[PDB]
Design an enzyme around this catalytic site. Structure first.
Site, PDB file in Angstrom:
ATOM      1  CG  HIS A   1      42.003 -27.477  82.473  1.00 26.77           C
ATOM      2  ND1 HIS A   1      41.380 -28.655  82.820  1.00 26.77           N
ATOM      3  CD2 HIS A   1      41.706 -27.260  81.167  1.00 26.77           C
ATOM      4  CE1 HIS A   1      40.729 -29.129  81.771  1.00 26.77           C
ATOM      5  NE2 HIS A   1      40.902 -28.296  80.757  1.00 26.77           N
TER       6      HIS A   1
ATOM      7  CG  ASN B   1      46.514 -32.484  74.910  1.00 20.24           C
ATOM      8  OD1 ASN B   1      45.868 -32.560  75.955  1.00 20.24           O
ATOM      9  ND2 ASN B   1      47.130 -31.375  74.530  1.00 20.24           N
TER      10      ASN B   1
ATOM     11  CG  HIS C   1      41.278 -21.712  76.177  1.00 22.33           C
ATOM     12  ND1 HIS C   1      42.648 -21.842  76.188  1.00 22.33           N
ATOM     13  CD2 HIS C   1      40.774 -22.950  76.388  1.00 22.33           C
ATOM     14  CE1 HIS C   1      42.959 -23.115  76.395  1.00 22.33           C
ATOM     15  NE2 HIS C   1      41.839 -23.809  76.521  1.00 22.33           N
ATOM     16  CG  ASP C   2      40.918 -23.958  79.744  1.00 21.63           C
ATOM     17  OD1 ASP C   2      39.672 -23.891  79.769  1.00 21.63           O
ATOM     18  OD2 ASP C   2      41.548 -24.883  79.164  1.00 21.63           O
TER      19      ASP C   2
ATOM     20  CD  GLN D   1      43.650 -40.181  76.433  1.00 22.75           C
ATOM     21  OE1 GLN D   1      43.751 -39.545  75.384  1.00 22.75           O
ATOM     22  NE2 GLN D   1      43.018 -39.701  77.500  1.00 22.75           N
TER      23      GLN D   1
HETATM   24  O1  DD5 Z   1      37.555 -31.026  82.055  1.00 25.34           O
HETATM   25  C1  DD5 Z   1      36.335 -31.254  81.314  1.00 25.34           C
HETATM   26  C2  DD5 Z   1      35.282 -32.004  82.203  1.00 25.34           C
HETATM   27  N1  DD5 Z   1      35.135 -33.495  82.218  1.00 25.34           N
HETATM   28  C3  DD5 Z   1      33.690 -33.814  82.104  1.00 25.34           C
HETATM   29  C4  DD5 Z   1      33.310 -35.302  82.242  1.00 25.34           C
HETATM   30  O2  DD5 Z   1      33.998 -36.066  83.247  1.00 25.34           O
HETATM   31  C5  DD5 Z   1      35.260 -35.564  83.715  1.00 25.34           C
HETATM   32  C6  DD5 Z   1      35.537 -34.063  83.526  1.00 25.34           C
HETATM   33  C7  DD5 Z   1      36.538 -31.973  79.944  1.00 25.34           C
HETATM   34  N2  DD5 Z   1      37.872 -31.879  79.368  1.00 25.34           N
HETATM   35  C8  DD5 Z   1      38.541 -30.752  79.122  1.00 25.34           C
HETATM   36  C9  DD5 Z   1      39.762 -31.099  78.578  1.00 25.34           C
HETATM   37  C10 DD5 Z   1      39.735 -32.504  78.490  1.00 25.34           C
HETATM   38  C11 DD5 Z   1      40.752 -33.453  78.032  1.00 25.34           C
HETATM   39  C12 DD5 Z   1      41.999 -33.136  77.483  1.00 25.34           C
HETATM   40  C13 DD5 Z   1      42.896 -34.158  77.120  1.00 25.34           C
HETATM   41  C14 DD5 Z   1      42.554 -35.500  77.305  1.00 25.34           C
HETATM   42  O3  DD5 Z   1      43.319 -36.605  77.019  1.00 25.34           O
HETATM   43  C15 DD5 Z   1      44.658 -36.469  76.594  1.00 25.34           C
HETATM   44  F1  DD5 Z   1      44.662 -35.927  75.355  1.00 25.34           F
HETATM   45  F2  DD5 Z   1      45.380 -35.685  77.423  1.00 25.34           F
HETATM   46  C16 DD5 Z   1      41.315 -35.807  77.864  1.00 25.34           C
HETATM   47  O4  DD5 Z   1      41.043 -37.128  78.015  1.00 25.34           O
HETATM   48  C17 DD5 Z   1      39.978 -37.436  78.884  1.00 25.34           C
HETATM   49  C18 DD5 Z   1      40.049 -38.934  79.060  1.00 25.34           C
HETATM   50  C19 DD5 Z   1      39.431 -39.404  77.746  1.00 25.34           C
HETATM   51  C20 DD5 Z   1      38.199 -38.532  77.587  1.00 25.34           C
HETATM   52  C21 DD5 Z   1      38.565 -37.255  78.323  1.00 25.34           C
HETATM   53  C22 DD5 Z   1      40.440 -34.794  78.221  1.00 25.34           C
HETATM   54  N3  DD5 Z   1      38.563 -32.961  78.997  1.00 25.34           N
HETATM   55 MG    MG Z   2      38.158 -24.988  78.873  1.00 18.77          MG
HETATM   56 ZN    ZN Z   3      41.499 -25.802  77.317  1.00 18.98          ZN
END
Ligand code: DD5
Ligand code: MG
Ligand code: ZN
Ligand code: D5N
Ligand code: MG
Ligand code: MG
Ligand code: MG
Ligand code: MG
Ligand code: ZN
Lengths: 329, 324
Positions: A78, A239, A118-119, A287
């Site tokens: 982020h 992504n 936004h972030d 993923q």
């Molecule tokens: O940051 C929050 C808070 N979370 C709440 C629950 O537990 C951990 C923290 C959520 N968030 C924001 C952005 C992404 C995200 C962006 C790209 C991701 O994968 C790849 F495309 F890069 C990605 O993959 C994660 C692994 C698979 C499921 C999520 C996540 N997630």
């Molecule tokens: Mg956000």
């Molecule tokens: Zn974002």
């Protein structure tokens, strides 16, 4: 010229600013870690937004640099590169043929500005972590869309810094409208609103109206803002739809960020959040789950709305799902 | 002394809260909250040290502004006491847990803390720092909550120190849900939903309401505190008249700020062109009576005397307005 420096080759990469899969990491390197400033400047020039809204170029650059400085360099995912990515992805989505002439220049400005802020000032931990640790931010915002309220407040507050008010020449009514749209868009990026947002997008697709050329007919603010909210949410969740090398890097970065949060939880004797335990992770499997449960359902619905504009994005998503499936140990 | 005699009326609608304010040395919120906590045995139930309770209440009361005519500690004390009476309505007997009762009373106490004496719309229109912080959305109400909770961090102010983790989490959620529902921009939606709840309400043999999930329970608590917040016109006329004087003073001061800034003066905020009587009859007809008649339906016949007073006060305020 590109609004930073120095030894170019940057120009050749920026030729892909209108394409899905612009290599944003290359842009970050070539710009001396100023991808958000470079990409925003390029987009504002391309869309003629400086002229339309009488935005002085030095004011735009000063604001962008200040905004970029408030994305944390030590946050793996982020950060300013993610912001640049979401801006550029929104910029491509706005140009989809199904949306031709649908949005006003002010609505376009709102979507792009919302994407950029936004972030901002993201600490690299989740809303739930902020709530669970009784953070000052969660106290300020009463546990509701804690990060997203904060990103908005910071992004708007930065307009007040010296020579940073990029909206100085908007009318009072334009400023009010843009502010409302930006708030509506950024609050919709809270992942806890995803299921509701998608359900409503499905409803919109069921009742969609188009011209013979397949261009969407939006009737009112509700229609327009719903499309913009979902567009920026899709950009935020884009992504896995990108060329695989970009996706692989984004995955490495989010896992680094998640694992650091898990380390904080473990140190405090807290339950470690899902996917945040470096000692017990299944990155590839996770993923595939992310795609099956969140990203594909969203993008399949967007693809329906703008059919057939997003067919290649969807195809890439499906290929990328197979990559991670094939690399599960 | 005289204060103890006046506090004998703490369980009654129409407590003379202005007298209590005078007699307590301008500490109506502290004395009324303390009395209610003793009356409901809340200190024992939740292991709240009396010194901690008084310390918190005095600091909370200190954070209501003396120079704000309506939205001050007297209003807070009034809403607390009114909620306390509504909680004891026969239709709700044994419905709410002690934690839910604590949440509603605490919410009432903090619900307007640090109020600046101007509206959300004023704060939004003047590009205030508060509206910037809160993205123009329930600006005051979010702030009241943040301040009310923040004050628990002061020395010997954590009145919830002996609640379990789960109790604290539950209380926090309920208090937030309640105070956010005091935002007047949410009134019509709250009312529309309350009407539908009334339509489909379930009661036991003894005629007590059945609320079998969080959504229904919190909905009742939200509307209860909203009714308490909007209870002035349901009080004895002498009290109501005083509340009306105060809100008009506050409104006119906002209108003066608007006029100085060259802004359009908000409805009812122009001291030169306002009818107090017309505005109260409008407030009752369009907001207060529709709400209270719906509450009255929910708890029928518990609130009939309150509704009667409201209707009497409406007829009183319209009496000097010429009509065809
Ligand atoms: O940051 C929050 C808070 N979370 C709440 C629950 O537990 C951990 C923290 C959520 N968030 C924001 C952005 C992404 C995200 C962006 C790209 C991701 O994968 C790849 F495309 F890069 C990605 O993959 C994660 C692994 C698979 C499921 C999520 C996540 N997630
Ligand atoms: Mg956000
Ligand atoms: Zn974002
Ligand atoms: O501002 C009010 C909303 N409007 C909307 C349309 O009808 C008129 C009132 C609600 N509100 N919000 C905060 C404080 C109060 C509020 C509280 C006690 C009030 O009157 C009396 F009981 F003391 C009160 O009176 C209003 C002011 C002039 C007309 C009636 C207002
Ligand atoms: Mg100018
Ligand atoms: Mg439509
Ligand atoms: Mg209030
Ligand atoms: Mg009526
Ligand atoms: Zn109030």
């Amino acid at each position: 010229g590109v609004k930073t420096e120095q030894e170019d080759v940057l120009a050749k990469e920026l030729e892909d600013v209108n394409k899905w899969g612009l290599h944003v990491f290359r842009i970050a390197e070539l710009s001396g870690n100023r991808p958000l400033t470079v990409i925003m400047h390029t987009i504002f020039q391309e869309r003629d937004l400086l002229k339309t809204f009488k935005i002085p170029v030095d004011t735009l650059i000063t604001y962008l640099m200040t905004l970029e400085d408030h994305y944390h360099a030590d946050v793996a995912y982020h950060n300013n590169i993610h912001a640049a990515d979401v801006v550029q992805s929104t910029h491509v989505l706005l140009s989809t043929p199904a949306l031709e002439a649908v949005f006003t220049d002010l609505e376009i400005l709102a979507a792009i500005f919302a994407s950029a802020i936004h972030d901002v000032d993201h600490p690299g931990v989740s809303n739930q972590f902020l709530i669970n640790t009784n953070s000052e931010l969660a106290l300020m915002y009463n546990d509701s869309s804690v990060l997203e309220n904060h990103h908005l407040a910071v992004g708007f507050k930065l307009l007040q810094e010296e020579n940073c008010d990029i909206f100085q020449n908007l009318t009072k009514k334009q400023r009010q409208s843009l502010r409302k749209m930006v708030i509506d868009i950024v609050l919709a990026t809270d992942m806890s609103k995803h299921m509701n947002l998608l359900a409503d997008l499905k409803t919109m697709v069921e009742t969609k109206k188009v011209t013979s050329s397949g261009v969407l007919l939006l009737d009112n603010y509700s229609d327009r803002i719903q499309v913009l909210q979902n567009m920026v949410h899709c950009a935020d969740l884009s992504n896995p739809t990108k060329p695989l090398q970009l996706y692989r890097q984004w995955t490495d970065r989010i896992m680094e960020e998640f694992f650091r949060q898990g380390d904080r939880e473990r140190e405090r004797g807290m339950e470690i959040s899902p996917m945040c335990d470096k000692h017990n992770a299944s990155v590839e499997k996770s993923q595939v789950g992310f795609i099956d449960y969140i990203v594909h359902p969203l993008w399949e619905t967007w693809a329906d709305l703008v059919h057939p504009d997003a067919q290649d994005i969807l195809d890439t998503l499906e290929d990328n799902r197979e990559w991670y499936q094939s690399t599960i140990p």
